[PDB]
Design a protein around this ligand. Structure first.
Ligand SMILES: *[C@@H]1O[C@H](CO)[C@@H](O[C@@H]2O[C@H](CO)[C@@H](O)[C@H](O)[C@H]2NC(C)=O)[C@H](O)[C@H]1NC(C)=O
Ligand SMILES: *[C@@H]1O[C@H](CO)[C@@H](O)[C@H](O)[C@H]1NC(C)=O
Ligand SMILES: *[C@@H]1O[C@H](CO)[C@@H](O)[C@H](O)[C@H]1NC(C)=O
Ligand SMILES: *[C@H]1O[C@H](CO)[C@@H](O)[C@H](O)[C@@H]1O
Ligand SMILES: [Mg+2]
Length: 436
């Protein structure tokens, strides 16, 4: 995709911290950028849209290559159009913004400079942030996570990609998303079809795969921490059903792990731990600490979680499911959880902890998003039962307190239009350096 010249792109400021030890943190002046999929996409020749609603202009975009040559991504009105407010240490994302048109959700990335994403290697480090999820009801997902996107947004080896990181180009994840307009320096017009169960109501011929570390996927009801493996940790392009993931005829036929090794306290049997008025009280802001421990060879072997609220350090809740012990993500936990729950261990299939180690070594980009779920209504995160018809007595079925009828986008985009999330006070450093 090309650089549009009709609207200046100014990345809103976001300060975050590097810590070296407890009580020793210094500030970094970062910036945030909106994902390309949310942007106006128009001809390089003028103002004519290449994409409108959920379909393409086939004169401007007769094929994937020509479309990339012909079409430019332009600058974003962050607050006015997208309800994104980045100031000081905080990033607020609003769910619905009814400006000149209706906007639902957003996906943003942390930048090091105007043309590069910040990258992270969290081996032997912890990532820590504050979050307010009080305004997130059933069906919402405020996600803070990491994917090994190319730092430059792909421009170095993609001649038709000039927009790059500057315009939030280069997304990939463990679902191999096919709703992306641009993948690996090409458009995705070929095979594009409208689809009711896609976030943007459309799906192209190709998907964008990579590893994915879901540090935080949450609302006021439930939270999940989920690493996802991949054969190749950085971006690969997949074709149709061979993609696997959400929209394939065979979810597990691809090169990535679409399910991940998840820890949701409620799913792991403790319904008193996380939620409104609970041990981690979602009525108010809290600190989320995620630690990435290694074996003696420097390969990831454990993900730990701590919360801090009112100055009280709260260890992650123990899994209470018989056969699934502990309060962290380890190979023993992942194997036991998949076996006991009766879920396919695609996590292990695509390299598990070694895969995530490789993803960290490649360098991770920080993603901060707010979304509703056109495929499963976020029931996988917060429902009394997922699947909706499954036995709530069966281990792994219950994930939260939300009804099986909750979270339908056409419902909640109305009823929960005021929903928002605030991420703040991001800190990265060695184990134990960001809290005490
Ligand atoms: C991106 O997806 C499109 C659509 O599926 C692919 O285009 C197909 O290419 C094959 C092989 O050249 C042709 O036989 C088909 O006619 C094309 N289909 C359509 C609908 O145009 C394209 O190959 C994909 N690109 C990559 C890199 O995988
Ligand atoms: C598509 O783009 C072309 C070239 O700018 C333009 O002439 C045409 O009006 C657009 N719309 C349609 C429906 O073809
Ligand atoms: C971090 O703190 C915990 C709890 O005090 C301790 O068990 C662990 O050894 C510490 N690890 C490092 C690397 O400092
Ligand atoms: C469009 O229709 C599909 C069924 O194919 C639903 O899953 C989706 O929620 C939307 O209503
Ligand atoms: Mg998709």
């Amino acid at each position: 995709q090309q650089i549009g010249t009709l609207t200046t792109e100014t990345h809103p400021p976001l300060t975050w911290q590097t810590c070296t030890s407890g009580g020793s943190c210094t500030t970094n002046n970062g910036k945030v950028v909106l994902d390309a999929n949310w942007r106006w996409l128009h001809s390089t020749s003028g103002s004519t849209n290449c994409y409108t609603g959920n379909t393409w202009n086939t004169t401007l975009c007769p094929d994937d290559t020509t479309c990339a040559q012909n079409c430019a991504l332009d600058g974003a009105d962050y607050e006015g159009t997208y309800g994104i407010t980045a100031s000081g240490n905080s990033l607020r994302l609003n769910f619905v913004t009814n400006g000149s048109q209706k906007n639902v959700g957003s996906r943003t990335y942390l930048m090091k400079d105007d043309t590069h994403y910040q990258t992270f290697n969290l081996l032997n480090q912890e990532f820590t942030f504050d979050v307010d999820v009080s305004g997130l009801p059933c069906g919402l997902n405020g996600a803070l996570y990491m994917v090994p996107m190319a730092a430059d947004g792909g421009v170095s080896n993609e001649p038709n990609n000039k927009a790059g990181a500057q315009y939030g180009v280069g997304y990939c994840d463990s679902q191999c998303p096919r709703d992306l307009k641009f993948i690996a320096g090409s458009a995705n017009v070929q095979g594009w079809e409208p689809a009711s169960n896609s976030a943007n109501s459309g799906l192209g011929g190709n998907g964008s795969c990579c590893a994915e570390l879901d540090i935080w996927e949450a609302n006021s009801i439930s939270a999940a921490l989920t690493p996802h493996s991949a054969d190749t940790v950085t971006q690969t392009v997949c074709n149709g059903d061979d993609c696997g993931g959400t929209y394939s005829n065979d979810r597990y036929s691809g090169t990535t792990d679409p399910d991940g090794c998840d820890f949701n306290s409620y799913r792991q049997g403790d319904t008193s731990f996380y939620g409104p008025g609970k041990t981690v009280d979602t009525n108010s802001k809290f600190t989320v600490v995620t630690q990435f421990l290694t074996d003696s060879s420097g390969n990831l072997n454990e993900i730990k979680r701590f919360y801090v609220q009112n100055g009280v350090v709260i260890p992650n809740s123990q899994s209470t499911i018989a056969g699934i012990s502990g309060n962290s993500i380890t190979q023993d936990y992942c194997t036991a959880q998949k076996q006991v729950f009766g879920d396919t261990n695609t996590w292990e299939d695509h390299g598990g902890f070694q895969s995530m180690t490789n993803a960290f070594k490649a360098g991770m980009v920080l993603v901060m998003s707010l979304w509703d779920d056109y495929y499963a209504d976020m029931l996988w995160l917060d429902s009394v039962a997922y699947p909706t018809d499954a036995d709530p007595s069966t281990p792994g079925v219950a994930r939260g307190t939300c009804s099986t009828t909750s979270g339908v986008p056409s419902d909640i985009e109305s009823s929960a239009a005021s929903a928002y999330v605030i991420y703040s006070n991001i800190k990265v450093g060695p184990i134990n350096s960001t809290f005490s």
